[PDB]
Ligand binder design. Structure first.
Ligand SMILES: C/C(=C\CC/C(C)=C/COP(=O)(O)OP(=O)(O)O)CCC=C(CF)CF
Length: 267
């Protein structure tokens, strides 16, 4: 039960046909078998549903983030994912791209992230990049915390490793807009983003138990309640005409798409 319209970028065919060129050029995919395994994931299709408002190079950046993220998560399914020290050793080299240029000795997965992070920040305000860099560190730090494992207790850990916030951040960059920063920090928007995080991880774990389906139903109903409060929220923070349009873009092209896009991709 998701009362949100399914949407997909009109440039999804070209983005899916060219998805392999970027990971091959950064050494993330080096064999024809690895390429076919990547195409079987449908990651470009997922990006076209997360970012239906993006075409061309903007959508290609969304495809690359999906390609990089699943290539990154697969590097921890072996013995390294069980040892938290080796997990932090790799995430530190990736997260170092948020602090400055990476040394040439960095693994290819690190140079890949740096290329994505460089394109994510172009054209965005300095305060937006600092906030988005902060969101990545929260994911990497939560990735190390989850590695230190070798109902409410699992939510506090999975809410950072589900990666919804860095996905939503790219929708702003892909749409070339920024939600008003004081509205992002609002209690209403935080509750909406918390719903988008909780629903995404509940749907991903589906891969006595009907209690989870009703939890998704309840949070989606609460999400609609919070959406109706946004007009009054815009007045509380004294939004102008352009800021209200950016807030509307953020609601439809970033938060709504990250909830509906994951459902249509899993199904
Ligand atoms: C919100 C996003 C995707 C929808 C939810 C998903 C697939 C989250 C991924 O959770 P995982 O712990 O990596 O398990 P999985 O590899 O899917 O078996 C984009 C982030 C992509 C990731 C890929 F790993 C985040 F981990």
């Amino acid at each position: 039960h998701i009362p949100l319209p399914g949407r997909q970028s009109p440039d999804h065919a070209r983005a899916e046909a060219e998805q392999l060129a970027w990971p091959r050029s950064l050494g993330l995919i080096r064999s024809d078998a690895a390429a076919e395994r990547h195409l079987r994931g449908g990651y470009a299709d997922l990006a076209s549903r997360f970012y239906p408002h993006a075409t061309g190079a903007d959508l290609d950046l969304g495809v690359d983030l999906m390609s990089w993220w699943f290539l990154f998560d697969d590097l921890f399914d072996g013995p390294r994912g069980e040892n938290p020290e080796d997990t932090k050793q790799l995430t530190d080299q990736v997260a170092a791209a948020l602090d400055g240029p990476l040394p040439d000795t960095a693994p290819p997965i690190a140079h890949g992230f740096a290329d994505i992070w460089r394109r994510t920040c172009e054209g965005m305000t300095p305060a937006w990049c600092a906030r988005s860099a902060r969101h990545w560190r929260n994911y990497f730090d939560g990735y190390v915390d989850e590695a230190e494992s070798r109902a409410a207790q699992y939510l506090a850990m999975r809410r950072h490793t589900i990666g919804v916030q860095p996905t939503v951040d790219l929708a702003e960059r892909a749409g070339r807009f920024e939600v008003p920063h004081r509205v992002f920090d609002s209690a209403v928007m935080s509750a909406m983003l918390q719903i988008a995080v909780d629903v995404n991880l509940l749907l991903n774990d589906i891969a006595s138990v009907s209690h989870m389906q009703n939890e998704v139903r309840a949070r989606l109903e609460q999400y609609l309640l919070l959406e109706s409060c946004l007009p009054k929220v815009g007045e509380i923070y004294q939004l102008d005409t352009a800021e209200r349009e950016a807030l509307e873009r953020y609601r439809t092209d970033a938060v709504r798409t990250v909830i509906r896009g994951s459902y249509d991709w899993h199904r």
